[PDB]
Ligand binder design. Structure first.
Ligand SMILES: [Mg+2]
Ligand SMILES: [Mg+2]
Ligand SMILES: [Mg+2]
Ligand SMILES: [Mg+2]
Ligand SMILES: [Mg+2]
Ligand SMILES: [Mg+2]
Ligand SMILES: [Mg+2]
Ligand SMILES: [Mg+2]
Ligand SMILES: [Mg+2]
Ligand SMILES: [Mg+2]
Ligand SMILES: [Mg+2]
Ligand SMILES: [Mg+2]
Ligand SMILES: [Mg+2]
Ligand SMILES: [Mg+2]
Ligand SMILES: [Mg+2]
Ligand SMILES: [Mg+2]
Ligand SMILES: [Mg+2]
Ligand SMILES: [Mg+2]
Ligand SMILES: [Mg+2]
Ligand SMILES: [Mg+2]
Ligand SMILES: [Mg+2]
Ligand SMILES: [Mg+2]
Ligand SMILES: [Mg+2]
Ligand SMILES: [Mg+2]
Ligand SMILES: [Mg+2]
Ligand SMILES: [Mg+2]
Ligand SMILES: [Mg+2]
Ligand SMILES: [Mg+2]
Ligand SMILES: [Mg+2]
Ligand SMILES: [Mg+2]
Ligand SMILES: [Mg+2]
Ligand SMILES: [Mg+2]
Ligand SMILES: [Mg+2]
Ligand SMILES: [Mg+2]
Ligand SMILES: [Mg+2]
Ligand SMILES: [Mg+2]
Ligand SMILES: [Mg+2]
Ligand SMILES: [Mg+2]
Ligand SMILES: [Mg+2]
Ligand SMILES: [Mg+2]
Ligand SMILES: [Mg+2]
Ligand SMILES: [Mg+2]
Ligand SMILES: [Mg+2]
Ligand SMILES: [Mg+2]
Ligand SMILES: [Mg+2]
Ligand SMILES: [Mg+2]
Ligand SMILES: [Mg+2]
Ligand SMILES: [Mg+2]
Lengths: 141, 129, 149
RNA sequence: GCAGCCGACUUAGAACUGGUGCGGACCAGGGGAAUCCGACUGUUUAAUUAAAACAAAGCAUCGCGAAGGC
RNA sequence: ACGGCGGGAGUAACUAUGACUCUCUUAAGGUAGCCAAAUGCCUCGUCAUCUAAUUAGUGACGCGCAUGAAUGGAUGAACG
RNA sequence: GCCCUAUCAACUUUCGAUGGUAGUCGCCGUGCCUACCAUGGUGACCACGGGUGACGGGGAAUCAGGGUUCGAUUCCGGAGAGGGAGCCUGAGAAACGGCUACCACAUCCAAGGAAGGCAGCAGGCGCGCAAAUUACCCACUCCCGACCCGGGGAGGUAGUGACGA
RNA sequence: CAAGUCUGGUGCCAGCAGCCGCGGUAAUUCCAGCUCCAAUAGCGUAUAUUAAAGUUGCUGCAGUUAAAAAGCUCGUAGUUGGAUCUUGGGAGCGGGCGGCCGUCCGUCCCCUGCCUCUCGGCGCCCCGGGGCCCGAAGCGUUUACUUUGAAAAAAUUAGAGUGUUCAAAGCAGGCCGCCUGGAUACCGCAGCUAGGAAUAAUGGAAUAGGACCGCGGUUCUAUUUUGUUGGUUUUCGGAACUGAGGCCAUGAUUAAGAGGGACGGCCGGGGGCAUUCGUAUUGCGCCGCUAGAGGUGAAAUUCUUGGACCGGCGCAAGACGGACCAGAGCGAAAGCAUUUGCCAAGAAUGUUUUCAUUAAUCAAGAACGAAAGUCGGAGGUUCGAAGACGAUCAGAUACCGUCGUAGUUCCGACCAUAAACGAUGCCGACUGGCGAUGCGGCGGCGUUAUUCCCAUGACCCGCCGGGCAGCUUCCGGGAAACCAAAGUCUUUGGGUUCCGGGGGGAGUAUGGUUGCAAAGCUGAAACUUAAAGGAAUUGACGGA
RNA sequence: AGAAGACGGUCGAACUUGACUAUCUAGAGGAAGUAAAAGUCGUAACAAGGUUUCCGUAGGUGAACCUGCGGAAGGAUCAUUA
RNA sequence: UGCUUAAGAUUUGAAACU
């Protein structure tokens, strides 16, 4: 503080009440248009419909082509690059299905080596992907 | 300019210790300051001082012993009830053994150990140890 | 700390501890009162009075010999002007400046000192409108202060 | 600061009454949203063309010191 | 001051209009800016809107048979 | 005695705004409303206007001391039964498991006409990342009535149940 | 961050990984075996969120160089404001410093007003008189602050009691008809009560309509009694109005190393208007002799026998004021140097003058603000954006060289931005020295001129104020360079203004607004990234 | 006692015609911006970076950038003699 | 006593007490 009087309360509180707005985690979470422009809209999962299978290069020291799925959502109608986590599990995804997308884990931020991919895939066609990968379950034919 | 004379005296009595002086002069004579020094004298932190009288804000010459670590002053002045004086001496003093928060009341200026005797609280002026 | 200047000067009088009177001053408390009724009736400011009185009469402070000070003495008879003298000389100054600006448009400095004299006027005149030596409808109007010479 | 005399026209505010009719005849501007050309006023093909044409203010070039320039 | 402002085919690291040029012969070789306009043959050019339905209108694209800078180019209240 | 915003700094007032007088209505006090006069009232100590993924309070989670965030949800108190206005009986309701009309949604018809309102318990449609049995009973706690004696999907007991402890 | 350099496959491919990081033919990190770990009927992965975060900072942050103090003063709200008014006396006990006082310390108790010579007098001492000591009835002209007292829905939480076989719960139950239990505490901000009077605000008498204390006048009203009862008059009082008086110790705190104001001699490139001088630069004129002169590293465009360049005499014009000029002065900052004159202003010092808190910092709203740039007018020496040209170069639309418009200068209207930098807000003090330099002042040996010397000038040695500075240092701090402040800071608080919260997107969009235009003041997000940046150390490197 | 019924006043939902808060569509493509192991033409910056750099302002140029007029040292000078 | 002197592909480093 810099002023230290006995009745200087509307100066202190109308100074902190302005300078809180220059925080980053207060401004993104609290009032503002981030909850407006969230593709999920302030929730932790979202269903979607696949429209295409594409791959993405990796950044520096690394040299590979990671695998991603262009998804259009139900509740808004926007478009998302997802991510296929495990090995070879692109060959179980056929066109025009439903996938259950979960956020990645750095709170909407680019991760690792992959340039600009926020969201990942958990379930495919109401069949859990760890079982479809392992073998406990089987795709409904 | 000078909004508090007691607050420019406890700093003028703070800067003579870290140098290592023996005697010092203060310019205004408050009746508050005089009741303050005669609070520190009863605990023997300093010697016996004296006041110099012109027909103005008189002066004071203080003799200093070597038991005075730091004399302070609180700004602004507050109100301290009996359930706050614990939370001031919790975090404004080194230990619970010594150190003396001093505060005026409607009964006079006294320390907190006495304010527990008289069951009284009032406005705070400072602290010394 | 000055008002409108960055100076920090220290130069003034210093009265000693000894208030009391000298011995060679045989003048009475009311003979000095006639010396003052003489001088102010002729016309002189209260400060120049206390200069003449310690240059041709040998008195240090008039408060120490009489009971009250100079203006308060004059005040109980009726010889004091209504506006005080320091306001009078800050109007005579703001007039001789507004005249110099009127004959000189390109004088930015006298343009700058005029605003500050105007502030020490509109700052005094509300000390006097609370000490109540003036009616609350006394106003330093700019272009008519020269009538109140 | 009051009395008495003469005297011109207007403006405002209420009340009543008529079959919703009242600027009762005459007199008396239809309007909005956009493009092209020209700045406007003004002028002309008297007797088929009055305009988007010429003019115009502004702007810019050229010759010439008198036996000379046009 | 009248007047003039074309050409040689591709250069990359997947379409590929095309980077950067290639390339230079007879005086330099269409910059800023505007458009199917009162100037654009192919022509009712293509796209969106105006309509139940629009060879006309309005907005955009430019490869302009043959747009363009005092032979004036782009501009914008009032007025007709 | 309250949340965000000055990219809202001037507002209200013959369309009652702020007051005086006499009345009308109404359970009573008042611009609540008429009739006549006066021109005033709030505001940088943040009025006015706008937002709110705002129902408020008792309280819950983490915490040295200070505090931040959450309180739709079993208790108290108010609001509302698709949206808005109107009124009867009655001590008490502008009531909706009571009536009269409009708008929107909607049923049976012999085509002349008739009737309706789950944000009551169950259960489906829908929207969704997202949430259970169209079961049994007045015995418990209590409420209603003309009343020891008849009723109550209020309520209780079971079924689903990896919220969690 | 607890735990395999075990074995077999792929070979920057497929893939793991929250972060650093692994994979290109022997991978402890990949797909699998074996083995190993942490939690265990539960465990991971998303999202919202609190602590950690003194990375939102009232307790408790930063602002010289890293993100950071408006270009500068003025200024209404606001916030904060110097010193000063009442000291005391006895009653008792515990106790030890000392030759029964005590010098006594500790601690409790007692010594506020009458409005009650009208409440109205409960007792109680005093000698029908009022009367003492003293329960209460009903004011005692204030807030702010502090303590007490009532009042505050349950549940919840914290908490005693109990052995549901323990436990989370629950309020029951324990003995041979009996005995109980079902507690307490806590409960801000305001309002009511009741005491407290340090601090912090605010009051009276100075045109004296002054505050009591009585004598005189004029208008008034209520009752009991002059028997019962009707005009009138008083007493007694309870309201105004009003004449001369007496009286108080009869009334104005001090004059800040806070501030305003007057006077006094001085100072300075401080500011405005007028006056004057100076070489030079270009140009022009007439003379004097002759083939080159400019100009670069080297040359050429350029000038020249109609006489250039140099030399002398003259003459016009418009700018600029060197050398004297320094870590010197002034000004709020930008800024200010020829002589002379006029108009008013201002610092510092001197002051035994004056008024007596008039002050400090400052939201909105205002004045000034170098250069360049704009619209007008005069004036156009020299330089000179744009431009043309000659070389250089692979190419130069650039540096180099000749010419050159707009401008550079003056008066008048605008615009308000700079590394406007000391890259360090303003007021306040405080805490070490050492030499200097500049104005005003205080003394002093002595030289120097005036000569006829006190006094004025020039040196020399000291003191004091404040003004730009400087060396030196273990005050002290700091990440360090470095600072008498960037110090008095975990031993954290003197007052008070503006502003920053990772980097970029971006001082952009939009919305307002001032401006003739150029542009300026307010001023976000979407997305995107794990580093960008400051100070010192070593090495290699330099056409240093 | 009173069934229908009407005069006008009141309360007034609802209907055709003007302004504000928040949300959306083709969206030109004109224009941007960022981000992607290896492209083209160049050399502005860091050493005196080979013309010392950097801010403010105007004008120009394929691109970085150039050139003027008053600043700053975050520079390669804490200094240059009577 | 100073003339010119443009350029150079993407990846690849880590330490314990007895
Ligand atoms: Mg603080
Ligand atoms: Mg990374
Ligand atoms: Mg001030
Ligand atoms: Mg058009
Ligand atoms: Mg015409
Ligand atoms: Mg004709
Ligand atoms: Mg005709
Ligand atoms: Mg073109
Ligand atoms: Mg059109
Ligand atoms: Mg053409
Ligand atoms: Mg032209
Ligand atoms: Mg409620
Ligand atoms: Mg805390
Ligand atoms: Mg918090
Ligand atoms: Mg209720
Ligand atoms: Mg009704
Ligand atoms: Mg109702
Ligand atoms: Mg029903
Ligand atoms: Mg319905
Ligand atoms: Mg409901
Ligand atoms: Mg029943
Ligand atoms: Mg029920
Ligand atoms: Mg179960
Ligand atoms: Mg781990
Ligand atoms: Mg958090
Ligand atoms: Mg920080
Ligand atoms: Mg910085
Ligand atoms: Mg600055
Ligand atoms: Mg600035
Ligand atoms: Mg309650
Ligand atoms: Mg006070
Ligand atoms: Mg000179
Ligand atoms: Mg401002
Ligand atoms: Mg000009
Ligand atoms: Mg030039
Ligand atoms: Mg060039
Ligand atoms: Mg100029
Ligand atoms: Mg100008
Ligand atoms: Mg400032
Ligand atoms: Mg940021
Ligand atoms: Mg960095
Ligand atoms: Mg390559
Ligand atoms: Mg460079
Ligand atoms: Mg250089
Ligand atoms: Mg350079
Ligand atoms: Mg250039
Ligand atoms: Mg140049
Ligand atoms: Mg530098």
């Amino acid at each position: 503080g810099k002023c230290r009087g006995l009745r200087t309360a509307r100066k202190l509180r109308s100074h902190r009440r302005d300078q809180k707005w220059h925080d980053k985690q207060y401004k993104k979470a609290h009032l503002g248009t981030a909850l407006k422009a969230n593709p999920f809209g302030g929730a932790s999962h979202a269903k979607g419909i696949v429209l295409e299978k594409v791959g993405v290069e990796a950044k520096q020291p690394n040299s590979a082509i990671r695998k991603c799925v262009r998804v259009q959502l139900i509740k808004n109608g926007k478009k998302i690059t997802a991510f296929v986590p495990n090995d070879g599990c692109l060959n179980f995804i056929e066109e025009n299905d439903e996938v259950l997308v979960a956020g990645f884990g750095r709170k909407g931020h680019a991760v690792g080596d992959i340039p600009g991919v926020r969201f990942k895939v958990v379930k495919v066609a109401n069949v859990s992907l760890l079982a479809l990968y392992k073998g406990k379950k089987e795709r409904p034919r | 300019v000078r909004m508090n004379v007691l607050a420019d005296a406890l700093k003028s009595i703070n800067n003579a210790e870290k140098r290592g002086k023996r005697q010092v002069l203060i310019r205004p004579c408050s009746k508050v300051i005089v009741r303050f020094l005669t609070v520190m004298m009863k605990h023997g932190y300093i010697g016996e001082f004296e006041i110099i009288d012109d027909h103005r804000a008189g002066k004071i010459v203080v003799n200093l012993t070597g038991r005075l670590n730091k004399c302070g002053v609180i700004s602004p002045r507050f109100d301290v009830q009996l359930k706050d004086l614990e939370k001031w001496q919790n975090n404004l003093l080194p230990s619970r053994q010594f150190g003396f928060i001093v505060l005026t009341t409607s009964a006079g200026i006294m320390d907190h150990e006495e304010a527990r005797r008289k069951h009284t609280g009032g406005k705070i002026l400072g602290f010394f140890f | 700390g000055r008002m409108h200047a960055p100076g920090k000067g220290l130069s003034q009088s210093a009265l000693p501890y000894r208030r009391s009177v000298p011995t060679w001053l045989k003048l009475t408390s009311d003979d000095v009162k006639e010396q003052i009724y003489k001088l102010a009736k002729k016309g002189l400011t209260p400060s120049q009075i206390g200069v003449i009185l310690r240059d041709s009469h040998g008195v240090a402070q008039v408060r120490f010999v009489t009971g009250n000070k100079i203006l308060r003495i004059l005040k109980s008879k009726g010889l004091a002007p209504d506006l005080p003298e320091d306001l009078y000389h800050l109007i005579k100054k703001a007039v001789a400046v507004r005249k110099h600006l009127e004959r000189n448009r390109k004088d930015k400095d006298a343009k700058f000192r005029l605003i500050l004299i105007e502030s020490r006027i509109h700052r005094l005149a509300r000390y006097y409108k609370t000490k109540r030596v003036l009616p609350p409808n006394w106003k330093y109007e700019s272009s008519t202060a020269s009538a109140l010479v």
